[PDB]
Amino acid sequence: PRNISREESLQLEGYKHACHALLHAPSQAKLFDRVPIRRVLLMMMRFDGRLGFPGGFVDTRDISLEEGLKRELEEELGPALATVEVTEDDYRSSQVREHPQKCVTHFYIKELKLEEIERIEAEAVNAKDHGLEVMGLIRVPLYTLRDRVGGLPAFLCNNFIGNSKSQLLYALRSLKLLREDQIQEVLKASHR
Amino acid sequence: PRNISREESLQLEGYKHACHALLHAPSQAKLFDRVPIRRVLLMMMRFDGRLGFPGGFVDTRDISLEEGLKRELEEELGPALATVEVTEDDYRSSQVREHPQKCVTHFYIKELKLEEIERIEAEAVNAKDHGLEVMGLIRVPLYTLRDRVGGLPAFLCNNFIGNSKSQLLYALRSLKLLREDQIQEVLKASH
């Protein structure tokens, strides 16, 4: 897994392309009327027993990288998605690997309204891929509990696909949710 | 933790009790049209970032174990559980611990019709505890993919609460889903 630019990745010869998106919306809710949720971020349990972002292989010679993702998004999340924009302005980063397939993964971040995320969760059960590729949607706990492990650190101890965990960390710093030192603290507490 | 009978654990004083349940239904669906799903098993992502079964603490001095689970299941899974009765016949096993704290955990298993699991999934977003104490429902992949890892083996590499992983393995053997050899197989490919 190595960092590559969009402009360069698209001119690669033969390698397979993939697109995935973090969908998120602000929230005033408090766990135990005490711990702020801050933000709702969506991930999923996949058919393969691993956690990941919605999306997938972007049929490279079809339409745009955006159109490919949009399709996967509706395929995997459901009908509510047809009215989700997801432009080029929602592109974030790309990576190349030769690990298992020789592949390029493109990460996307889009902010929605909480109402929108709620409806997406609500209609997720109607996605072509519900119970198939998508075993259920989940929210990322952003907080850390009093035992300093429960919440996000404990969350990061689950099994992630490709480099979705890497991508998640990126988003967290990217959206100003946690500084680097906090990100390191939650990893160290998660390591042991 | 340690094995204890139901009747024996209910005679204990100064212990905490909790009940958790695996709701499941048969399915004819085939992943990629080739790989049988076989059965649908519900678990959840919890507030603490771990996988677990729905359920919770029950005060034995106020309500029975069944009433407690019943209320906790409505709270955690939502309104569709009003049509579902998990009774004494669904009770399976109990484990007891003293350290860290005096706690007894009861495990229930109940079969439903596929439309019931589907409706529970649909209405879980209305649960009192959704997006707070319950972060979302998930199905347990029962199959192993061609790489011999994807599916159940990889799922078992996730972060589970208390002995919830062990409750799941018990259910797999109990429901005649996997042989003792297959469970050991699935477990090896994990670690």
Ligand SMILES: Nc1nc2c(ncn2[C@@H]2O[C@H](COP(=O)(O)OP(=O)(O)OP(=O)(O)O)[C@@H](O)[C@H]2O)c(=O)[nH]1
């Ligand atoms: N970096 C990163 N890679 C991922 C993520 N999810 C999947 N991958 C990798 O992307 C590739 C395929 O993506 P999938 O989502 O499994 O394929 P899919 O698009 O759902 O399947 P199709 O419906 O046929 O398009 C695999 O090699 C995974 O390793 C993710 O969230 N982040």
Ligand SMILES: Nc1nc2c(ncn2[C@@H]2O[C@H](COP(=O)(O)OP(=O)(O)OP(=O)(O)O)[C@@H](O)[C@H]2O)c(=O)[nH]1
């Ligand atoms: N064996 C087992 N233990 C669990 C499971 N889930 C939680 N526990 C443990 O059982 C105890 C209570 O479980 P919780 O369900 O987290 O507590 P709760 O009563 O649901 O929380 P409230 O919604 O605030 O009432 C805690 O010690 C957990 O660590 C489970 O699925 N199986």
Ligand SMILES: [Mn+2]
């Ligand atoms: Mn996908």
Ligand SMILES: [Mn+2]
């Ligand atoms: Mn897909």
Ligand SMILES: [Mn+2]
């Ligand atoms: Mn596809």
Ligand SMILES: [Mn+2]
């Ligand atoms: Mn596919």
Ligand SMILES: [Mn+2]
């Ligand atoms: Mn609970």
Ligand SMILES: [Mn+2]
């Ligand atoms: Mn509860």
Ligand SMILES: [Mn+2]
């Ligand atoms: Mn409770």
Ligand SMILES: [Mn+2]
């Ligand atoms: Mn509650």
